[PDB]
Each structure stands twice: as structure tokens, then as C-alpha cells.
């Protein structure tokens, strides 16, 4: 039952693969990300705002882990 982990984990890379310096903006990066089944799948399961929230997290981590 490894989807909650891996699909998120992968998506969490998707963020790290696009959003490096955190200076990005979610919408624009989801523009980017949406061209990837990765972002889709996760947003399909969980949600776009939670993927935003997920972006935010990583952002913070980028900012200061």
C-alpha cells in the first residue's frame, strides 16, 4: 500500500526538481510541474492545495531546514 509515501515522495522530488532556491511561486511551478504525471497523480490523490502546502514545506526547507 505504498502510494501515500512514494507518490508523495516522488512529487516531493518534483518540487525539488523544479523549486531549488524556493524563490519560485507555486502557481508558476505547478505550471511547470503539471506537465508531469508525477504532480498530476499526487494532486489527483491528495489535492492541489496540499501539493501547494507540500511545495510550501519544501520551500521552507529550502529556506531553512
Curated annotation (Swiss-Prot):
<comment type="function">
    <text>Rho GTPase-activating protein (GAP). Binds several acidic phospholipids which inhibits the Rho GAP activity to promote the Rac GAP activity. This binding is inhibited by phosphorylation by PRKCA. Involved in cell differentiation as well as cell adhesion and migration, plays an important role in retinal tissue morphogenesis, neural tube fusion, midline fusion of the cerebral hemispheres and mammary gland branching morphogenesis. Transduces signals from p21-ras to the nucleus, acting via the ras GTPase-activating protein (GAP).</text>
</comment>
<protein>
    <recommendedName>
        <fullName>Rho GTPase-activating protein 35</fullName>
    </recommendedName>
</protein>
<feature type="modified residue" description="Phosphotyrosine">
    <location>
        <position position="42"/>
    </location>
</feature>
<feature type="domain" description="FF 1">
    <location>
        <begin position="4"/>
        <end position="61"/>
    </location>
</feature>
<comment type="subunit">
    <text>Interacts with RASA1. Interacts with the general transcription factor GTF2I, the interaction sequesters GTF2I in the cytoplasm.</text>
</comment>
Amino acid at each position: 500500500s505504498q502510494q501515500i509515501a512514494t507518490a508523495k515522495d516522488k512529487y516531493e522530488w518534483l518540487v525539488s526538481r523544479i523549486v531549488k532556491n524556493h524563490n519560485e511561486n507555486w502557481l508558476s511551478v505547478s505550471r511547470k510541474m503539471q506537465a508531469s504525471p508525477e504532480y498530476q497523480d499526487y494532486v489527483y490523490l491528495e489535492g492541489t492545495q496540499k501539493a501547494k502546502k507540500l511545495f510550501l514545506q519544501h520551500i521552507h526547507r529550502l529556506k531553512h531546514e
